Design goal:
About 35% of the residues lie in helices and about 25% in strands. By secondary structure, it is an alpha+beta fold. The protein has 4 domains: about 190 residues, Immunoglobulin-like; about 100 residues, Zincin-like; about 160 residues, Orthogonal Bundle (Neutral Protease, domain 2); about 150 residues, Peptidase M1, leukotriene A4 hydrolase/aminopeptidase C-terminal domain (Serine Threonine Protein Phosphatase 5, Tetratricopeptide repeat). The longest helix is centred in the middle third of the chain and has 22 residues. Bound molecules: 1-(4-thiophen-2-ylphenyl)methanamine, ytterbium (III) ion and zinc ion. 1-(4-thiophen-2-ylphenyl)methanamine binds next to helix 6.
């Protein structure tokens, strides 16, 4: 059972379909309308059921054309309030009914960010975007807010006529609103059953450009051309992903490039992946994030974690496929380089949390834990590390990719646990059970800290990064002169990034060294967000006051939590910038993403 949801479990009843009919009110910052849930009983004599909600105003509940009794329970912190609905007629097993709920969201909905015109590129129109993963769908509409339940959906969304609505679904047409000629209704259909965390909505001044046979890029006009170029590898990655995972079942693969406050690198919303504009490096260098979102079209969206305790299933397999796509595009040596970088990121997380911390377990227990607080690189990189280790144990990438395809096939349209996965691994590799029995399952799955075994990694592309990092770390003042721009001559942006990641692991460095680095390498000039991020962290941790306004600027001018949280934490930990860090958060907090605002607040202890 799902300890993050207050709703009736799938063993009691199952939502089959949602029909959403709503209107987006920018003046009140509310979504208002009806959620018609088609619900199937899994039980004899079913007379009531419970749905998740969060900061919702319920107007009424209609079944068979009549209003019915319902009750909202006490709020249970981040989980919201359970909504019990009294059914007018007892249902037998497998009977289906339609429950129509009239509702309105709160302006403070944790699923939503409402932006004013000034927070947009165009400066003329406001903008709304949603982010339901993990348990924020309940903050938009009453539902069984659990990925153990999969449903199809259709929607009609009324918005001001000069704006465009898009959803995680196939666009099903647009018309003027019959009830308000200042408005348009956009329609949508998602024919593939999905967990509700994949329900997504954006409303804004969006334009589009085609970039492949099944891909449009959407953004405000100011970002269209840059995005089109940045993400032009999309079709090639789709074709590789299809070869590894099987048929792409979703119809279109569109991309939406959000305003800078989008809290993640990407969100695998079906038909319409959302991405941060921090990917717009100008050279396609951050395209692994596209490869990752693409991969989710199989691992996560087809095969889904049953509860959030098993999130590593989603993320581990996705990073595994992601790195295969990039290895196919750029070479096996590059896949190894990225894999080893991933291990470094895992070292960082474990170090940050502490090696005995419960969140460093692969499988976690989220009872009384807000998933947003628990979120880290761990399920991503410990999950990937397990798969990469198993790959090497079981005969290599070709063999293990056979397993991954059979795994996707086996569990498509289903929600599964770690035991489901492990059971199938044993079934698939039944001629290799002796080898599988060598794995320390208890440690890998259930123990905190770094994995019991580290995989083997080709070092070719990593060597120069480590070598240069070591030069700087071991350098004394009289060695600083020997550093020069030519040190970077043969390094890719990826290698520059890894050089910085290596050095950041030993931070602080002497202030004079960092000053010299800027002198000879001019890292302040680099706009690649991954590079600039690590460089600013290195500067602040090394107590360079000059970097304070740069770090403050990056932390606030975009809101990708990966960057904003550690930049804020670094700034707070530096005595010279502490007060300004706190003041800056205080001033920006009301106009930040609500989840980001909450977490930075916790991070800063304000
Ligand atoms: N992106 C929302 C989010 C999704 C998953 C999780 C976790 C599941 C298990 C450990 S963290 C946390 C936050
Ligand atoms: Yb010396
Ligand atoms: Zn992911």
């Amino acid at each position: 059972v799902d300890t993050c949801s207050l709703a009736s479990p799938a063993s009691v009843c199952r939502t089959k379909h949602l029909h959403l009919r709503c209107s987006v009110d920018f003046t009140r910052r509310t979504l208002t309308g009806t959620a018609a849930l088609t619900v199937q009983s899994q039980e004899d004599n079913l007379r009531s059921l419970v749905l998740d909600t969060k900061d919702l105003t319920i107007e009424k509940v209609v079944i068979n054309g009549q209003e019915v009794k319902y009750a909202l329970g006490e709020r249970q912190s981040y989980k919201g309030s359970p909504m019990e609905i009294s059914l007018p007629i007892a249902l037998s097993k497998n009977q289906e009914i339609v429950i129509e709920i009239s509702f309105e969201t709160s302006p403070k909905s944790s699923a939503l960010q409402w932006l004013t015109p000034e927070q947009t590129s165009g400066k003329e129109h406001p903008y709304l975007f949603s982010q339901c993963q993990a348990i924020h769908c309940r903050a938009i509409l009453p539902c069984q807010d659990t990925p153990s339940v999969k449903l199809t959906y259709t929607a009609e969304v009324s918005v001001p006529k000069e704006l465009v609505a898009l959803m995680s679904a196939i666009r099903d047409g647009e018309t003027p609103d019959p009830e308000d000629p200042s408005r348009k209704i956009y329609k949508f259909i998602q024919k593939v059953p999905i967990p509700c965390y994949l329900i997504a909505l954006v409303v804004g001044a969006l334009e589009s450009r085609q970039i492949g046979p099944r891909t449009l890029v959407w953004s405000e006009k100011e970002q269209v051309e840059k995005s089109a170029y940045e993400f032009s590898e999309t079709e090639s990655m789709l074709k590789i992903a299809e070869d590894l995972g099987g048929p792409y079942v979703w119809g279109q693969y569109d991309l939406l490039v959000l305003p800078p406050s989008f809290p993640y690198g990407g969100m695998e919303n079906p038909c319409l992946t959302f991405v941060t504009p921090t990917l717009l490096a100008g050279d396609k260098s951050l395209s692994n994030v596209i490869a990752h979102e693409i991969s989710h079209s199989w691992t996560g969206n087809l095969v889904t974690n049953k509860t959030w305790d098993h999130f590593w299933l989603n993320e581990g397999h996705t990073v595994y496929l992601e790195r295969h796509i990039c290895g196919r595009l750029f070479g096996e040596k590059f896949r190894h380089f990225n894999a080893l970088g991933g291990w470094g990121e895992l070292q960082n997380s474990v170090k940050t949390f502490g090696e005995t911390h419960p969140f460093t377990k692969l499988v976690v227990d989220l009872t009384d834990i807000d998933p947003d607080v628990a979120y880290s690189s761990v399920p991503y990189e410990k999950g990937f590390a397990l798969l990469f280790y198993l790959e090497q144990l079981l005969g290599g990438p070709e063999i293990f990719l056979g397993f991954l395809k059979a795994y996707v096939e086996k569990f498509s349209y289903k929600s599964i646990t770690t035991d489901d996965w492990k059971d199938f691994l044993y079934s698939y590799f039944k001629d290799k059970v002796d080898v599988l029995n060598q794995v320390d399952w208890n440690a890998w799955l259930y123990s905190p800290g770094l994995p019991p075994i580290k995989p083997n990694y080709d070092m070719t592309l990593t060597n120069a990064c480590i070598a240069l990092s070591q030069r700087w770390i071991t350098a004394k003042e009289d060695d600083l002169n020997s550093f020069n721009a030519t040190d970077l001559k043969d390094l890719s942006s990826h290698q520059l990034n890894e050089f910085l990641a290596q050095t950041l692991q030993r931070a602080p460095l002497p202030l004079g060294h960092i000053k010299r680095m800027q002198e000879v390498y001019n890292f302040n000039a680099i706009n690649n967000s991954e590079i600039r991020f690590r460089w600013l962290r290195l500067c602040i941790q090394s107590k360079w006051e000059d970097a304070i306004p740069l770090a403050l600027k990056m932390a606030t001018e975009q809101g990708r939590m990966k960057f904003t949280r550690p930049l804020f934490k670094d700034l707070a930990a530096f005595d010279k910038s502490h007060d300004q860090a706190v003041r800056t958060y205080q001033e920006h907090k009301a106009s930040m993403h609500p989840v980001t605002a909450m977490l930075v607040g916790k991070d800063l202890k304000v």
